[PDB]
């Protein structure tokens, strides 16, 4: 019968690893590098688009940075199509929470929910896991600014600074070196771009090969603003930090 053709996506190896999760992580390691850095007065999200073309319409393009709600955003590394499935689920979850409790969803709760969905695909159903790793950048009134990551295993952890995708080993070393606790957003912006500039597989880091975003309390009085950077705004910040 059908058993003959079943790959068995949800099994342990003799060493106690989940084959498909490990292979999904191998896929993600070839994806464009995404970096998240958390500061005292905000969060930075930086990400590299993969070998683009001159004929790609950049200003209407979105492959890395997505908005979940007004307070929370995500950077993607892996299969974009898979990520959009999860992103729409997360957007719905955030709205369900808001309808139920009349309060914006705490960041961790949203992260846990998505991570639980990913976990399910590794334990039951016989389906391949989502080949996606997220960096969650968000704010709530309990813990303030928060950075999380989740991977196809459904495991999630909190970070001060973190990278996913390609060259994370090199990128994490550079972040661990120059990061300090009393750091500010403007400094974190510079660190993120410098790290990408050194870890990139491309010849040079340009505006057309980047997606960038910040979450700042730099909004008029006690409130939070999400800024998805436009192509011209990425070009300006590259000149300001002295990369181009």
């Amino acid at each position: 019968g059908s058993r003959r053709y079943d790959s068995r996506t949800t099994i342990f190896s003799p060493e106690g690893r989940l084959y498909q999760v490990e292979y999904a992580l191998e896929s993600i390691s070839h994806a464009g590098t995404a970096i998240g850095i958390m500061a005292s007065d905000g969060i930075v999200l930086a990400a590299e688009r993969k070998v683009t073309s001159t004929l790609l319409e950049q200003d209407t393009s979105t492959e890395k940075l997505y908005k979940l709600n007004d307070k929370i955003a995500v950077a993607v590394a892996g299969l974009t199509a898979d990520a959009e499935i999860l992103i729409n689920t997360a957007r719905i979850h955030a709205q369900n929470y808001l309808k139920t409790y009349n309060e914006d969803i705490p960041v961790e709760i949203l992260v846990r929910r998505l991570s639980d969905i990913k976990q399910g695909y590794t334990q039951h159903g016989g389906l391949r896991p989502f080949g996606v790793s997220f960096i969650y950048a968000g704010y709530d009134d309990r813990y303030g600014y928060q950075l999380y990551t989740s991977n196809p295993s459904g495991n999630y952890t909190g970070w001060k600074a973190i990278s996913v995708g390609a060259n994370t080993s090199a990128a994490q070393t550079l972040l661990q070196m120059d990061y300090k606790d009393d750091m500010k957003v403007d400094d974190a912006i510079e660190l993120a771009l410098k790290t990408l500039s050194k870890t990139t597989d491309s010849s040079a880091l340009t505006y057309d090969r980047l997606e960038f975003a910040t979450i700042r309390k730099g909004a008029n009085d006690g409130e939070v603003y999400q800024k998805i950077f436009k192509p011209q705004e990425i070009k300006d910040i590259l000149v300001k930090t002295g990369i181009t």
Binding site: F12, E15, K118, Q123, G125, Y143, S153, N155, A161
Partner: protein
């Protein structure tokens, strides 16, 4: 629905998927449980390969199931969340239907039953998780410490460890822990739990987590400095 039998017997009478789930536990960070005369302490390893971590928001290794019971684990982190959620739901369901909080033995039996169910259900793989469940029964001053594992077997322990290099710390506990006279105070119990982790951990900085549970829903997690004082005193006595 996906019905495929993943956990099955082999010619030599082994269920490999359940045994490979134990290998996932062996890979997991070390967890230790020690019960004193009037308390139980849960110690947990934090691997220092991950720095730049935000320790405020990172999921803690010890989880409260109810106000009087806690659960720590070794193995796959994502798998543990599913067991903990189920355990927490059952704990409230028990209070709701029977008007008493769960006993530690009952909660352990439930969690172990879930783990077992995933070893002979179609389309699912076993949990790659072993748990240490500790606490005090309602209106009782006797300490309780149980262990579970992927196969679904569970048992009570005077002291026990699970995870990577658990063989070494179990060796330490077997010679150091005396049943006739267990750690009389909280200090003695915590000290013995830290000592046991220092056989394996590496550095005694942010790699050791300690959680003390006392009777009548008195649960507290020690801080870095409080633990560091234990690490200091242990090694100063060792230099002799």
């Amino acid at each position: 629905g996906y019905d495929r039998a993943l956990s099955i017997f082999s010619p030599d009478g082994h269920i490999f998927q359940v045994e490979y789930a134990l290998e996932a536990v062996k890979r997991g960070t070390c967890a230790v449980g020690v019960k004193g005369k009037n308390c139980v302490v849960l110690g947990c390893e934090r691997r220092s390969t991950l720095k730049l971590q935000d320790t405020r928001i990172t999921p803690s290794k010890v989880s409260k199931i109810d106000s009087h019971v806690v659960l720590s684990f070794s193995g796959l982190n994502a798998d543990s969340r599913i067991l903990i959620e189920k355990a927490r739901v059952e704990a409230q369901s028990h209070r709701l239907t029977l008007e008493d909080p769960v006993t530690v033995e009952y909660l352990t039996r439930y969690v172990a039953g879930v783990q077992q169910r995933y070893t002979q259900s179609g389309g699912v793989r076993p949990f790659g998780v072993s748990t240490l469940i500790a606490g005090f029964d309602p209106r009782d001053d006797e300490p309780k410490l149980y262990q579970t594992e992927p196969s679904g077997i569970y048992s009570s322990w005077s002291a026990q460890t699970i995870g990577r290099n658990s063989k070494t710390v179990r060796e330490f506990l077997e010679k150091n822990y005396d049943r006739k006279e267990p750690p009389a105070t909280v200090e003695e119990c915590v000290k013995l739990t830290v000592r046991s982790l220092l056989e394996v951990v590496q550095t005694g900085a942010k790699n050791i987590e300690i959680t003390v549970v006392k009777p009548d829903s008195d649960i507290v997690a020690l801080s870095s400095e409080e633990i560091n004082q234990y690490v200091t005193q242990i090694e100063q006595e060792k230099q002799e």
